[PDB]
C-alpha cells in the first residue's frame with residue numbers, strides 16, 4: 001500500500017508499457033500503450049481514429065495502470081483524458097518520449113493527456 | 127491483426143500477468159492479475175472482497191488484456207466473469223496455476239472465470 005513519491009516517480013519514468021482502461025455503457029476496453037509521465041500526467045501519442053477515440057469522446061473518465069519489476073510494483077492512475085492542442089506541451093511530451101524509447105499509427109494522430117486526479121501504488125509479493 | 131490459433135495459445139500459456147478491466151457507471155478500473163488460460167477461458171484466484179468484487183457484482187461484463195514479448199503480441203479478451211463453484215473445474219484451474227507459476231489474499235477467496243466470448247490478437251512494431 002506504498003506511498004514513497006520518489007520511488008513511484010522513478011518507476012513511472014522507467015516502466016515501458018501502460019494499460020489504458022475505458023468504458024462506454026458498462027463495457028470495458030483495455031489497451032496497452034507507450035507513454036511518458038510528465039507534469040502530474042500521462043501522455044501518449046495515438047491515432048486520432050479508432051475504438052479508443054469513439055469511447056473517449058463518449059466518456060473521458062479513464063484508468064491507467066502500470067505494473068512491473070523494480071517484488072512487483074503497480075500504479076493505478078484515475079483521471080480524465082483529453083487531446084493536447086498546446087503546441088509546446090505537445091512538443092515537450094513528444095521529445096520526452098523519444099528520449100525514453102529511443103535514446104505509422106499513420107494518417108491522423110494526436111497527443112493525449114490523462115490528468116492525474118487520483119493515483120494509488122502498491123508493492124506485491126507474487 | 128493476427129489469427130494463428132496456436133501462436134496465441136502458446137502466448138496465453140506463457141504470459142505471466144494480465145490486466146482486468148471493469149466498469150461501474152462510466153468509471154473504469156484496471157488491475158493486474160496472475161492467471162491461467164484453460165478451457166476457452168481465463169481463471170484467476172482472488173480475494174472475494176474488495177473494489178473488484180463490488181464492481182463485478184454490479185457489472186460482470188469485463189475485459190482481459192495481455193501483452194508481452196515472444197516484436198510485441200497483445201491479446202484482448204471480452205466476456206463475462208463469474209465465481210467458480212464447480213469443485214473440480216476449480217481444482218484443475220488451481221493446479222494449472224501452481225504448475226505455471228511455481229514449477230495471503232487472505233481471509234475469503236474464490237476462483238474467478240472469464241468466459242471468452244470474443245478474443246482479438248495483434249502483433250506490434252514498437
Ligand SMILES: Cc1cc2nc3c(=O)[nH]c(=O)nc-3n(C[C@H](O)[C@H](O)[C@H](O)COP(=O)(O)OP(=O)(O)OC[C@H]3O[C@@H](n4cnc5c(N)ncnc54)[C@H](O)[C@@H]3O)c2cc1C
Pocket residue numbers: 017031032033034035044045046047049050051052053105193198199200201202245246247248250252
Ligand atoms: C506494447 C505495445 C505498445 C503500444 N504502444 C502504442 C502507442 O503508444 N500508441 C498507440 O496508439 N497504440 C499503441 N499500441 C497499440 C494500441 O493498443 C493501439 O492504439 C490499439 O492497438 C489500437 O487502438 P484502437 O482502439 O483505436 O484500435 P481499433 O483498431 O479501433 O480496435 C478495434 C478492435 O481491435 C481489437 N484491438 C485493438 N487494439 C488491440 C490490441 N492492442 N491488441 C489486441 N486487439 C486489439 C479490439 O478487439 C477492438 O475491439 C501498443 C501496443 C503494444 C502491444
Ligand SMILES: Cc1cc2nc3c(=O)[nH]c(=O)nc-3n(C[C@H](O)[C@H](O)[C@H](O)COP(=O)(O)OP(=O)(O)OC[C@H]3O[C@@H](n4cnc5c(N)ncnc54)[C@H](O)[C@@H]3O)c2cc1C
Pocket residue numbers: 067072073074075076119120121122124126143157158159160161170171172173175176177178179231
Ligand atoms: C504482478 C501482480 C500480480 C498480481 N496477481 C494477483 C492475483 O493473481 N490475484 C489477486 O487477487 N490480486 C493479484 N494482484 C493484486 C491485484 O491487483 C489485487 O486483486 C488488487 O491489487 C486488489 O484488488 P481490489 O480491487 O479488491 O483492491 P481494493 O483493496 O478493494 O482496492 C481499492 C483501491 O486500492 C487501489 N488498488 C487496488 N489494487 C491496486 C493495485 N494492484 N495497484 C495499485 N493500486 C491498487 C485502487 O486505487 C483502488 O481504488 C497482483 C498484482 C501484481 C502487481
Ligand code: NA
Pocket residue numbers: 017067068143
Ligand atoms: Na507489464
Ligand code: NA
Pocket residue numbers: 017143193194
Ligand atoms: Na506486461
